[PDB]
Amino acid sequence: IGTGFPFDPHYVEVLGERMHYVDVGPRDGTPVLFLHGNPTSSYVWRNIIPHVAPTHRCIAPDLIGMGKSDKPDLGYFFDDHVRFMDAFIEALGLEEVVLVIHDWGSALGFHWAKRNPERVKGIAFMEFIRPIPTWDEWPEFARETFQAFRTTDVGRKLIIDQNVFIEGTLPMGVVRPLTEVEMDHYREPFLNPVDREPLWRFPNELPIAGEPANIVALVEEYMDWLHQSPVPKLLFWGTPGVLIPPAEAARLAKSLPNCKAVDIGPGLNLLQEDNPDLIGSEIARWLSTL
Numbered sequence: 142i143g144t145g146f147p148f149d150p151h152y153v154e155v156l157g158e159r160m161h162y163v164d165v166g167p168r169d170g171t172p173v174l175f176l177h178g179n180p181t182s183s184y185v186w187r188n189i190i191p192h193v194a195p196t197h198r199c200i201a202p203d204l205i206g207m208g209k210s211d212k213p214d215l216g217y218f219f220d221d222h223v224r225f226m227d228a229f230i231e232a233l234g235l236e237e238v239v240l241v242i243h244d245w246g247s248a249l250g251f252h253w254a255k256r257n258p259e260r261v262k263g264i265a266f267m268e269f270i271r272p273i274p275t276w277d278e279w280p281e282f283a284r285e286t287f288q289a290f291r292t293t294d295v296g297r298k299l300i301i302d303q304n305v306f307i308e309g310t311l312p313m314g315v316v317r318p319l320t321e322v323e324m325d326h327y328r329e330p331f332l333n334p335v336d337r338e339p340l341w342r343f344p345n346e347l348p349i350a351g352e353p354a355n356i357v358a359l360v361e362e363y364m365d366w367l368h369q370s371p372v373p374k375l376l377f378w379g380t381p382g383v384l385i386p387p388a389e390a391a392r393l394a395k396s397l398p399n400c401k402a403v404d405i406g407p408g409l410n411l412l413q414e415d416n417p418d419l420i421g422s423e424i425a426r427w428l429s430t431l
């Protein structure tokens with residue numbers, strides 16, 4: 142599994158702020174938009190893009206306040222990421238797209254797809270945001286931690302001051318051992334604790350036990366849309382998983398229209414780090430069928 146990031150920087154102005162994105166592959170077709178989540182960047186797609194790039198354009202932006210994008214003084218609520226990602230897509234003049242989404246990127250992708258259904262020709266997704274009705278439906282071993290993350294006192298000491306989402310939560314979301322080189326790439330954007338606001342607000346935005354109300358309703362809405370949509374779907378899952386257990390993955394493969402499920406083997410949250418070659422090859426294969 143490659144540790145390098147051999148991609149030239151591309152930048153575009155979005156609502157007054159510069160956002161960074163990877164941009165490779167030919168301009169003569171339908172682009173593929175890769176959306177990462179918390180606490181990652183376009184780096185998380187480094188070993189998946191080379192499988193798709195030869196046949197399709199690959200665009201992988203860093204969310205505002207993350208990766209190599211600018212760091213404006215914001216609360217970094219989901220609404221902020223929505224405004225910026227909406228404007229990013231328009232700034233690149235993209236008409237029709239295929240989405241490849243993960244974690245909070247999936248919340249952005251599905252929410253955008255719901256509002257622009259005619260512009261989405263396919264969605265590949267993995268370990269995605271869905272409504273968690275109660276704390277019982279959150280992984281048992283991470284309940285205390287994420288309950289602690291969702292506080293203004295303990296949560297901010299952990300995530301902001303001590304950087305545990307990078308130093309702990311990130312590597313614990315990968316089955317195989319993340320190397321020090323890979324950890325350093327993920328560390329780069331958040332060396333200053335003042336820049337870690339996005340890392341704390343994200344887990345506080347998760348739709349768990351009806352809070353926050355707005356995110357729960359927003360996510361419920363795009364899941365209803367996904368169940369009602371005939372758009373091609375590609376669901377990657379692993380065992381034991383984190384947000385999407387093997388049992389739920391199989392249920393979704395049946396209930397969602399036009400959905401193909403692919404088992405990646407052992408995995409937790411960052412499935413891209415456990416089996417990038419299968420994920421990449423299956424996206425390339427799937428794209429040719431569309």
Ligand SMILES: *CCCCCCOCCOCCNC(=O)CN(C)S(=O)(=O)c1ccc(NC)c2nonc12
Nearest residue numbers: 178179244245283286305308309310313314383410
């Ligand atoms: C996509 C958004 C959701 C991401 C889900 C990520 O789940 C991955 C698994 O979660 C691991 C939860 N545990 C931890 O983050 C850290 N543990 C609580 S820890 O290892 O016991 C721990 C405890 C305390 C401290 N510092 C005071 C730690 N620093 O690093 N790990 C620590």
Ligand SMILES: [Cl-]
Nearest residue numbers: 179343344347
């Ligand atoms: Cl999160």
